[PDB]
């Protein structure tokens, strides 16, 4: 079967629509998400047109094999979509109304700069390759674009699901291609990060600073070194839930900066001890007393600077 | 093949039934479960009706290809169900009796607020899309809804398997849809959590409190800091077996609260030492003596408050 | 194609046999095992019968499509078995001899009460659903039930592979079902658990007890607390290799009990120190001296009691 | 299609050959490896024979469906091989030349006794089941057995790929079976184990022995206990990369033995301290001085004994 | 269908082209990458040639089944590529223009010697096996070789995608094979390794060196032993993200060398203490004072030597 012939030299407009049934498995490391949705296609094939009076029927239902159906593919899927045709309905004027239910693992890049307070725009790219007979152009029927109410993405808030109505028409392998951008805007549920990572990480840091109220070198070494190891554990836990970015993430920046606080705390703990042994505890006392104010102030200001830079 | 024609302007009622053969793999993080069950469908196709006297047979057996079968799909499955038709039996009045055996990975949300003492309602949503010829409505044949005795879900107690008999009829893409709710009520087997997480977590906390019966700052620092690290390990162990919730879980609340106990224990240990060095051990003794009663009392009351809030 | 017609009102007896080719991947957490075996089926279809003299051939080979084959399914498989028909041989009395090679992930529950010294009975349930024409009953041809010599299950000893010859005939959805039980008896290779978990776990415990020969509170705190953390690591390592049971496992019981030994050791270490500071080292000496005998004796007796209760 | 008829009462000899294209994913825990290779089959079917003069062609190319092809299966694959027929060429005498390209996950047991200095013999078992018409026997055409130069197995050295030319002919289910053994000899690349596990493990042990040059019980307790925990971490790291063997592995033996060294070091550290408190430091000095020589000597001799026993 | 017949004794030239649509999942441990691309094939079949005047059409579109298509396979894929034919267009002279969209998991070895500052050349090997009728030779149509702009490989920089235009023609199983090399040059995004592994690893090492400004053996033991354990954790974290190489990697070399620094620091800490107890603190002071300069200088020079050797 060949494509529908043109009235003039116009291209064939295939009206599209994606209706999300299920949404799930957003893999941060892999930068992928799984989707289960309705795909709707509609185009005019004058060859399939009929008189409702003569035929008796108001619409004709065809099996996929029987008629010409445009080869609609997804640009950013890992493997070809697992589709099952729901219905094909031809109107008297030849307006075909195709509907399929698909499932696919979509590969869409993620921006982790403000993690875990980040928001993302997941993409679904519909594409059609023009045939030698005639050029095929994609369109968005906004009435067939949407999502089910029940849809939820674990640990994410689904903001919107819209389509960029004007297609990206370009040449590839000397043939026209019509690309459509379906955008699923989501924003991370940062809540859990606060009692699981942020607050425990701050508690261990504050525990390290109790060495500014101790003259016992042995106790201080234990305090600063132990807490530093707990901070390593938190850093490792965090980097496992994320991919390797060629940029600094918000949480990444905080965690890294905290290493410098542990480093300088060790230096202070060392200096205080050296001076005490050197029989200069008056100078050591001045340094320790200052550190009690310096460490939280410099920590608080550095964090304001980071939050400012990142948001 | 087209759908059965109506007697009047009535919709076609497809009677359904799910009989669970096997149940397994409830993924808490992914909020999914795998099912292996019987699907039964029954509708009246007057076109397939026959006289038992003339034909000789009491029922006629057809191959799926031969007759019209309603396109029944599952709303919340990840990928299309892996089904194999067991039997299709037509009665003389045209009452078709379809049976298939399926397996699917069902996506049903879980409520972790009372974890690990939580109970869940897993869902299986049957759906049918109405055709242009006529509207299709789902029904529950309670005689064909059930589960095998042997069925067990690892680490869960299967309470019930029922169906919400009245379907959720709605419009989607200008077409009628009939949705049915099959509910599998389950409740978690919290036993193992007690000797593996809860009791070990309490033991390390109680060990930290022995610093209230020690004047040795160095020993106290070791006691409170070490146990705190074991508590971090338990927190990390727990959060790996669970997804990121935008709410606090029962175990999550307990674990978080325990961090504050370690923090205040460090403050006490620090205060006691500062005072001792300051040549005020009488004041330090008062604080330590109070802490011996204060720490378990405030812990016990805080837990009563939490259990009350959560249950 | 319809089933073979009966001579009298007898049911159709389908003789079965499973011959294990490969055995592997027993998942303790998932309570599943993968199998790769021969499936043999044999039934009498009088309609396929022929004259050897007239036809020339002694047996006729048919393609699965050509003749009626009973719908034999496995009850406890996750997804439908991946089968490939090896041969179908019809004798001229109409005795069909079907053989297929399959592979499946079988879901069979495991009893961890005596882990790692446990033994299991893995099951393979053959099932047939009776048709409206006539009832189908399963049988075991003991000559076609067995396993290859090479077969081995990693970390397990394969004891036997037998079939419960009398089928479980019952009604389900107003139709007769014939269920057969193929049992693969296995017993765990507990060897590795001794030098990897049991002995290292005992060594750290015995190390903690050296605090009964030390008056240094600071050293004792280090000894008991450190070893307790190593015991947490061993407990966590063990629980990862196992599913959450609503009962206590043998290793689980030992590990849990050991926590109480660490708890009481801390109490002793604390008591001894308090008394020493209180200028009562004579009483502290009595307690420490007793503990040296009490701790191993109570440990040894408690273990005898556990081993007795568990075996 | 039936098998080729025999000239006399001889069996049909199917000449085989495996040419490895790609080799990869040797899973030590699962005892499996993935293969991507050429399968070649050649047998004489006199029914397909032709005169080159009359026909014009020197060889005839057939589609798999058109002619009889022997049912060649792999014994030790997990699931049936993913094969794609490359070519089928019939010579004038009826000598069929079949070639397919396959990929399979082969299950072959591994001997970890000398790990990580072990060598293995991976197996690929070709099998054919004889038909009721005539018996089928496998043969090795050594000219069609080999491997690509590029082939490499990550972390392994590929020694050889040969076939045991004489098949294992036996009865199974009253039918003849011809089994062939394709052996892929490999030897582990033990290099990485030296700077990652062996040397770090020895360093921590030697660090523990510095307690023989210290009279500080508190420091010694820290030295021996800390290093012992690092040794636990190494033992756990090792056992994760390996399956549970009912025998001792070389690395397993070394690691286990090292636990005894830590145990005895604790005993020494304890004894030395007890004696010092008991105001007998002369006796404690003798024990400590001996331990300085005893510990490395006994360690070195024990290792010679192990290496001897294992190799 | 047989291959196109030759004009003279020339081989059939199949012009190829790969256009990368999506690139992803480069597994360092498995040494694999997933690809989603366009495959284009073009050859001359004179049998399909036609007069544009007589036929009316300028090009003819065929279904894969209808005409002869060369059996093009990938050498280094794990399993056979998942391909879907996009278009087949025949020109009047018989120049066939085939296009398919594929997805495959390509196995290409990686060189980790300069990790994480390494660069790689991923390969895609196109291969064709010559038929008995005539020899088939591959060619590169440079106009149909490329990649989409959007293409990105997570944690990698895509440098180029070119093809080695002259094929590797060789004999295999007495038949000609034409192999083509498609090279995807990539270079690692080493950024993240600096704040996550390199700098934290240096910080803990520098913390260990504060023991050169402390006379407290107990504090020094804590400093050097604790930091050494954090270094073990970093070594383990690194080796999990990498496969077992029979060579030293850059990061591997640094990490290994750092163990020697911890070992010698322990020796210094031990020596200093022994001398102090031996009432020789003047000699111990000389050693400690030297170590303060020696340790960073020898560390810095050793690193220059390593960087030099590795780059
Ligand atoms: C002379 C003393 C030898 C000690 C040998 C210890 C044997 C342990 C055997 C374990 C077998 C499994 C229970 C662990 C106790 C550790 C030993 C404490 C030593 C105290 C030294 C006091 C010096 C007078
Ligand atoms: C303490 C740590 C001790 C390490 C034991 C050394 C290994 C060994 O002794 O292992 C022996 C292996 C096995 O080589 P093979 O050819 O298979 O021996 C077969 C010989 N027969 C047939 C006679 C039995 O030799 C090697 O790979 C030697 C180089 C590795 C040295 C690593 C040292 C660090
Ligand atoms: Cl697609
Ligand atoms: Cl479905
Ligand atoms: Cl509505
Ligand atoms: Cl409607
Ligand atoms: Cl099955
Ligand atoms: Cl096979
Ligand atoms: Cl391929
Ligand atoms: Na079509
Ligand atoms: Na149908
Ligand atoms: Na059949
Ligand atoms: Na065939
Ligand atoms: Na310490
Ligand atoms: Na073809």
Numbering used by the authors:
A (entry chain E), B (entry chain A), C (entry chain B), D (entry chain C), E (entry chain D): 5 to 315
Copy text verbatim from the article accompanying this structure deposition.
At present, the best structurally characterized pLGIC is the G. violaceus ligand-gated ion channel (GLIC), of prokaryotic origin. Each subunit consists of an extracellular domain (ECD), predominantly in a β-sandwich fold, and a transmembrane domain (TMD) composed of four helices, labeled M1–M4. However, the GLIC is a pH-gated channel, activated by lowering the pH, with a maximal activation at pH 4 and a pH50 around 5. We instead found that proton activation is a complex multiple loci mechanism, with the key contribution stemming from the coupling interface between the extracellular and transmembrane domain, with E35 acting as a key proton-sensing residue.
